[PDB]
Each structure stands twice: as C-alpha cells, then as structure tokens.
Design a protein around this ligand. Structure first.
Ligand SMILES: *[C@@H]1O[C@H](CO)[C@@H](O[C@@H]2O[C@H](CO)[C@@H](O[C@@H]3O[C@H](CO[C@H]4O[C@H](CO)[C@@H](O)[C@H](O)[C@@H]4O)[C@@H](O)[C@H](O[C@H]4O[C@H](CO)[C@@H](O)[C@H](O)[C@@H]4O)[C@@H]3O)[C@H](O)[C@H]2NC(C)=O)[C@H](O)[C@H]1NC(C)=O
Ligand SMILES: *[C]1O[C]([C][O])[C](O[C]2O[C]([C][O])[C](O3[C]4O[C]([C][O])[C]([O])[C]([O])[C@]43[O])[C]([O])[C]2[N]C([C])=O)[C]([O])[C]1[N]C([C])=O
Lengths: 97, 49, 261, 106
C-alpha cells in the first residue's frame, strides 16, 4: 500500500514563490493566485490582490508494508524429490532422495 | 502502472531507496477561508485487490 | 519511566468538518488520519491534543494536555470517549496517539470535556468494515475452538524505528492586541515576543516587546503576530509554515505491530 | 424549557408537571437517543430540534429531583436523505455547494 505525505502549505502574502523540483516520486507543484486564507486570527496576512498559495505533495511507500506485501515472481521449471519405504523383510529403512 | 489495477506501486526489493508510482495524483484550489490541500487521487489498487 | 523524547512539544488548533453540526470551527480536536493497517480490527487514531504528559513535561497517568487561545491548559483522561456508532472502549492511551477497538460504522469521533466544563467533539468521515480472519464470520472471541495467525499492536510504550517530523509554528495572526487611541494605536500588552507590521509607511516591521505608539492611522491598517518559537509542532497540512523549512524534530511512532495468534 | 417559575431566562433548567405543581430540573441530565446517543443542537421553548443518525425510534429522557430517569419513546421512520448524487454520511472538507434547507437558531 502507498501513502500521501503532505507537507505544510506555505502561503506567501503579496508575493510569489518558485518551486524548485526534487528527485522524488511524482513531486507535484502547484501555485495558485487569488486566495484569502481566513484563520483563527482574523486573516493570516494583510493584502488583497497579490496573494499566492503553495501546495506540494508526493506519494511514497507506506511504513508497514515491510511485513505484509505481495510479490510477483516469474516461474520456471521445477525439480522432484521423493521419500520411499524399502521393506524387504531384512531391516526396513526410510529414504529421501 | 495502470492506476487502480494490481500493484500501481512497484518496488524491486524490500528496501531499495528508489521506487515507481502512477497513483494518478492532481491538485485543486482551496475554498474561501479554509487553509488545506485539496488533492484528487484514485484510491488504492492494492487494497482493492 | 524516562522515555523523555518530548521536551519541546506543544499542541495546536486546526480546522475540522463538523463541530456538533454545520459550523466548522477551527477546533482543538483535529484528527490527522486513522491507520487500520493491522489485522485484528483495532484502529490507531492520531489526533490534535496529546495525552499522558502534564504542562511542564512530566509523565502522568490521568491528566491530559491541550491548547486554547495559544496558551496551555489541562484536563482529565477518565472523561474522554471514543466511538463510531456505539460507544467502544479505549484500549491504550499514550503520548499523542489514541488506540482502540470498535464496532463497525461509517464515522469515527473523539471527545473530552473542557476546563470550562464543555463537551467539545469532532467527527470525520471514515469507513471501518469488520475485516475477517479465518473462514468464519464471528464478532466475539469464543471459548472453545482453534486459533490462527494474526497481527496486532503491542502496548510497549517505548520503541523505535518509526517517526513523523516536527516543525515550529510560523507566526500567529491577531488583531486583538491592546491597540486603541482616538487617532493612534498603543503597541503592546503581552508577555512574549511580538512582530508588528503595517502599511502606513513611515516605519518598517520590527521585533518589539515593549509598548509603542504609531500615532497615525485607524486600527484597520495594522495586524500583529506572535513570533519566534519556544517549542515545536507537527507539520499538519492545515496550518502554514514559515521560511525555516526543515526537519528539526522527530518523534516515536509507538506500538509496533508483531506476529501473534 | 428555559423558564423557572418566576419569569427568567435560564439556559439550563426546565419546567415540568408533577402533582400539578411547577418543578424545576436542569439540562445537564437530558439526553436524546434513537440508534446511537443522539446529539442536540438547539433548545427553545416548547420545541426541540436535533440532528442524529437514522433509525426507527426516538427518545427523550431527563432526570427529576428524586433521581429517576423518566422517558417516553415513539415510532418514526427517519432515514438519511439524498442530496446530490453520492450517498455519504458525514460532511467532507471539500466539495460542491448545493441548495438545501436548514433551520435558523434565532
Ligand atoms: C511474522 O513472521 C514472519 C516469519 O515468516 C516474519 O518474516 C520475517 O521477518 C524477518 C525480519 O525482516 C525476515 O528476516 C530478514 O529476511 C530477509 C529475507 O530472508 C532472505 O534471506 C534469508 C537468509 O537467512 C533466507 O533464509 C530467506 O530465504 C530469504 O532469502 C533477509 O534479506 C534479511 O537479511 C539479510 O541480513 C541478515 C543480517 O542482518 C542476514 O542474516 C540475511 O541472510 C540477509 O543477508 C533478514 O534475515 C524473515 O526472513 C521473515 N520471514 C520470512 C519467512 O521471510 C514477519 O516479519 C513476522 N511479522 C512481523 C510483523 O514482524
Ligand atoms: C518393516 O516392515 C513392517 C511390516 O511388518 C512395516 O510395518 C507395519 O507397518 C505399519 C505402518 O507404519 C506399522 O503401523 C504403525 O505403528 C504406528 C505407531 O504409532 C501406528 O500409529 C500406525 O498406525 C501403525 O500401526 C506396523 O506397526 C508395522 N508392523 C510391524 C512393524 O510389525 C514397517 O513399517 C517396516 N519398517 C520398520 C522400520 O519397521
């Protein structure tokens, strides 16, 4: 199973950011204009028309599947082993071969 | 990596530091007021299987 | 006993989707997710406030910690509840994480009473269907029969090899600073460090701690901020970050799952 | 609810009839529950509105000064409505805004 790690959405008021990429699985950058974040303290910043929000997220292998997982194999020819009983009156042995 | 079929995440061993994914991930703009990260994704294929 | 690992950790208040009904107040009862990657049926729920540690960093059994008005307060654990459709019992309380077993349903929720004697709750959509083991469809552990292998969580409250990261609160907006005169503003009442900023352009932002006067403008021009940290927080996706984008702190994920019957 | 014998606005106490006198009792022991423990949201006068999960019954129980839990139940085929085209059970944190009809707390 996978997981969606989402770091914090750094918001810049009356400015703009530039997201330098990362060698990572599906590092996805998105920059939005025209935001008005309204948190507990009234507004977060004080500006009206140049606000930008940065949201970044990536997809990563979950932490528990070190113990459960499916594994696909290619499957080729096999071998054969046997176990026999060899009783002929004189002492009866068992054998694997 | 067909997103949502068997094994849309793939790893070549248990502990390789590189991996591959085609989760089908996108992003959307938030609503008025709420600060969050609206992300649209196909749900898991492995948990489906 | 010692296990300390926490000395610089502070709760937060985040946003939620329901607060009893409809009005989605930014509440102290955030739920980040619900991990259900075990096999018995239990849920490992991680939520906003943290439990077990008193105000100034000491191991407790029955007192809990939480936040209100960006200052620290406490409550009790014996008056906390978790349920989905019917009241289900908690099975373990440690640090920042809730641990329980619970019947099916389509919602999960946590609640506890406030130091102002209230009943703050929080609900979040999540589907929990009874995952089955063996070739039967039971619901309760019987007394006669056979057993089968299965994974579950262990109550060892100090164990390594899993973690989340920690950051610091960026800055806390407010307009509710003691700043009022007839054509002027009065520029603090506080006990901590503050960064002020405005747009009546004669003086830039600064890091004052004593009172000032800006003598010029009506109050709907300046907005104030709490500033640099004393402790750390969790990089929850619901509060922004400052320009210190790092991985300063990190903290145990307790209860590693192990083979059982 | 809300009215002690002498006219006042108490947010906690409730007036009822026993022995055709006028006895008080507080709201800190009033619960409603149909299929789970229901959750009240707004309490005024001679009516009570509340959200709570669907089922078949409904209940009111509050406790008197002699410490008994008098209650009464009735049958009612309440079930979850279908707004839009995806039958949820809990409001999510992002979606589409739609016309519905709710109650006002004034
Ligand atoms: C429930 O119980 C199961 C048992 O079936 C547990 O599975 C075991 O988990 C351990 C922990 O990782 C596994 O141990 C590791 O196994 C890897 C795979 O084993 C290969 O190599 C061994 C050599 O001993 C072969 O026998 C085997 O056929 C495989 O080819 C190894 O790669 C790991 O080790 C490397 O380093 C160590 C030294 O550190 C060397 O000794 C190894 O040789 C190797 O070079 C490590 O040994 C174990 O294999 C798992 N069992 C099985 C059958 O695979 C589950 O983990 C448990 N559940 C939970 C939740 O823990
Ligand atoms: C040798 O030879 C013989 C013949 O005789 C044989 O045998 C027989 O066989 C059988 C089978 O196995 C046996 O049996 C046994 O025992 C057991 C114990 O436990 C049981 O369980 C079973 O059931 C059975 O019975 C018999 O015994 C015999 N007989 C005799 C011996 O007599 C054999 O096998 C051979 N081998 C050897 C080693 O002996």
């Amino acid at each position: 199973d996978y997981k969606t790690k989402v770091p914090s959405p750094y918001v810049k008021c009356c400015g703009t950011a530039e997201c330098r990429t990362q060698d990572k699985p599906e590092y996805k950058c998105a920059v939005f204009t025209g935001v008005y974040p309204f948190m507990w303290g009234g507004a977060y910043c004080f500006c009206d028309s140049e606000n930008t929000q940065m949201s970044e997220a990536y997809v990563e292998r979950a932490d528990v599947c070190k113990h459960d997982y499916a594994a696909a194999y290619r499957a080729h020819t096999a071998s054969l082993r046997a176990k026999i009983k060899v009783t002929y009156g004189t002492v009866n042995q068992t054998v694997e071969a | 990596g067909q997103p949502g079929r068997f094994g849309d995440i793939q790893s070549r061993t248990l502990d390789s530091k590189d991996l591959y994914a085609n989760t089908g991930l996108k992003l959307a703009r938030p609503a008025a007021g709420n600060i969050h990260v609206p992300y649209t994704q196909t749900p898991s294929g492995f948990k489906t299987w | 006993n010692h296990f300390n690992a926490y000395k610089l950790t502070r709760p937060y208040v985040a946003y939620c989707a329901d607060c009893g009904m409809g009005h989605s107040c930014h509440s102290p009862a955030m739920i980040e997710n619900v991990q259900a990657d075990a096999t018995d049926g239990t849920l490992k729920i991680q939520f906003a406030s943290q439990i077990g540690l008193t105000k100034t960093d000491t191991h407790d059994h029955t007192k809990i910690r939480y936040a209100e008005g960006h200052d620290i307060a406490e409550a009790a654990r014996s008056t906390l509840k978790v349920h989905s459709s019917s009241e289900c019992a908690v099975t373990g309380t440690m640090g920042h994480f809730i641990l329980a077993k619970c019947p099916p349903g389509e919602v999960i929720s946590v609640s506890f009473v406030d130091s102002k004697n209230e009943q703050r709750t929080c609900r979040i959509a999540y589907h929990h269907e009874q995952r089955l083991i063996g070739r039967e469809r039971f619901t309760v552990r019987p007394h006669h029969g056979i057993e089968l292998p299965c994974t579950t969580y262990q109550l060892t409250t100090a164990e390594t090899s899993e973690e989340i990261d920690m950051h610091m609160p960026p800055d806390i907006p407010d307009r509710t600073i003691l700043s009022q005169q007839s054509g002027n503003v009065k520029i603090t009442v506080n006990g901590r460090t503050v960064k002020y900023s405005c747009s009546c352009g004669s003086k830039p932002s600064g890091t004052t701690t004593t009172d000032k006067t800006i003598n010029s403008c009506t109050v709907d021009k300046c907005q104030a901020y709490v500033t640099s940290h004393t402790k750390w927080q969790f990089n929850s996706p619901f509060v922004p970050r400052a320009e210190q984008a790092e991985r300063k702190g990190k903290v145990h994920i307790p209860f590693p799952l192990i083979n059982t019957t």
